[PDB]
Design a binder for this molecule. Structure first.
Ligand code: HEC
Ligand code: HEC
Ligand code: SO3
Length: 227
C-alpha cells in the first residue's frame, strides 16, 4: 500500500479546476442543501466519509477518498460488471442518500470527481492507500441487541437521540446524523450491513469489539426507508 496524504488547500490551483474542487468539497459536505433534487434523506456524504479541517473523505478507516480515483473502474458484484467512479457515486446517492443518481456528465458530479482527484494527487494509479474503506468487524456470535440498547443509551444517545433521529445544527444541517427512521440511510446502503456498521462504529468514529458488534445490532433492528 501507499500512505494516506492530504494535499494543502493553499496549493489549490487558480482557474477552472481549482474552482471545481472547491464546489466539489461543498457538494460532499452539504449534500442535501446543495443537491435537493438528488437527496432523499438528511445525510451528506461527510456523515460516513468524514474529514478534518473542512475536508471530506480524509480519515483512515472511514472510507477516505484519498486514492479512490485510481481504483476505478472496478468490478461490482451488485452490477455484475465493471463500473466507473461516477456510477459508484450514483449508487451512494440512491442508497446512502435515499435519493437519485446524478447524470454521469452532471457538473456537480464532475466537481465531486475533481475534488476526489485532488485528494488523490500523487497516488499511483492502481495503488491501494493505507486506511482505505471501512474495515468490517465480524464476531463469531449473534449481536446481542439487548446489550446493544444499553450501550446505545450510555454511549450514543446523547448525540444521535433516543429515537435515532440525530441533532440538527442552527442552519438545519445535521450536526449528529440520524441512525434510523425516515431521514437515515435506506436498506440498500452498505451501512445497513451488520459487519460494516460494526466496523464503522468501532473504527470510523473507546468501544471494545464486542460492544461495537452489539450496538450495531441494536441500531440495525430499527426501521428505515426501503430501497
Ligand atoms: C450512510 C453512510 C454513507 C453515506 C452517507 C455515504 N457513503 Fe459512500 N460509502 C459508505 C460505505 C460503508 C462504503 C464502503 C467502504 C468500503 O468499500 O469499505 C462507501 C464507499 C464509497 C465509495 C467507494 C470507496 C472505495 O474505496 O472504493 C465512494 C466513491 C463513496 N462511498 C462516495 C460517497 C459519496 C459521493 C456520498 C455522498 C453522495 C457517499 N458516499 C455517502 C457509506 C456511506
Ligand atoms: C460526540 C457525538 C457522537 C457520539 C457520542 C456518537 N456519534 Fe456517531 N456520529 C457522530 C457524527 C458527528 C457523525 C458524522 C461523521 C463524523 O463526522 O464523524 C457520526 C456518524 C455515525 C454513523 C454514520 C452516519 C449515519 O447517520 O448513520 C453511525 C452509524 C454512527 N455515528 C453510530 C454511532 C453509534 C452506534 C454511537 C455510540 C457507540 C455513536 N455513533 C456515538 C457523532 C457522535
Ligand atoms: O452504495 S451504498 O450507499 O450502498
Amino acid at each position: 500500500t501507499v500512505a494516506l496524504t492530504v494535499p494543502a488547500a493553499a496549493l489549490l490551483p487558480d482557474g477552472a479546476l481549482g474552482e471545481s474542487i472547491v464546489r466539489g468539497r461543498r457538494y460532499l459536505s452539504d449534500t442535501p442543501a446543495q443537491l435537493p433534487d438528488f437527496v432523499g434523506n438528511g445525510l451528506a456524504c461527510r456523515h460516513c466519509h468524514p474529514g478534518r479541517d473542512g475536508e471530506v473523505g480524509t480519515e483512515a478507516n472511514a472510507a477516505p477518498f484519498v486514492g479512490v480515483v485510481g481504483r476505478f473502474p472496478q468490478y461490482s458484484a451488485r452490477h455484475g460488471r465493471l463500473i466507473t467512479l461516477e456510477q459508484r457515486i450514483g449508487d451512494c446517492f440512491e442508497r446512502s442518500l435515499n435519493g437519485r443518481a446524478l447524470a454521469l456528465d452532471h457538473p456537480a458530479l464532475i466537481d465531486m470527481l475533481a475534488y476526489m482527484s485532488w485528494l488523490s494527487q500523487g497516488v499511483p494509479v492502481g495503488a491501494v492507500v493505507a486506511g482505505h474503506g471501512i474495515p468490517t468487524l465480524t464476531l463469531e456470535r449473534e449481536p446481542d441487541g439487548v446489550h446493544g440498547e444499553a450501550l446505545y443509551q450510555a454511549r450514543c444517545l446523547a448525540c444521535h437521540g433516543a429515537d435515532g433521529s440525530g441533532t440538527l445544527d442552527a442552519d438545519g444541517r445535521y450536526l449528529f446524523p440520524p441512525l434510523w427512521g425516515p431521514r437515515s440511510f435506506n436498506t440498500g446502503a452498505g451501512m445497513n450491513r451488520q459487519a460494516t456498521a460494526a466496523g464503522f462504529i468501532k473504527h470510523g468514529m473507546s468501544l471494545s469489539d464486542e460492544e461495537a458488534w452489539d450496538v450495531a445490532g441494536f441500531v440495525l433492528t430499527h426501521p428505515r426507508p426501503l430501497f
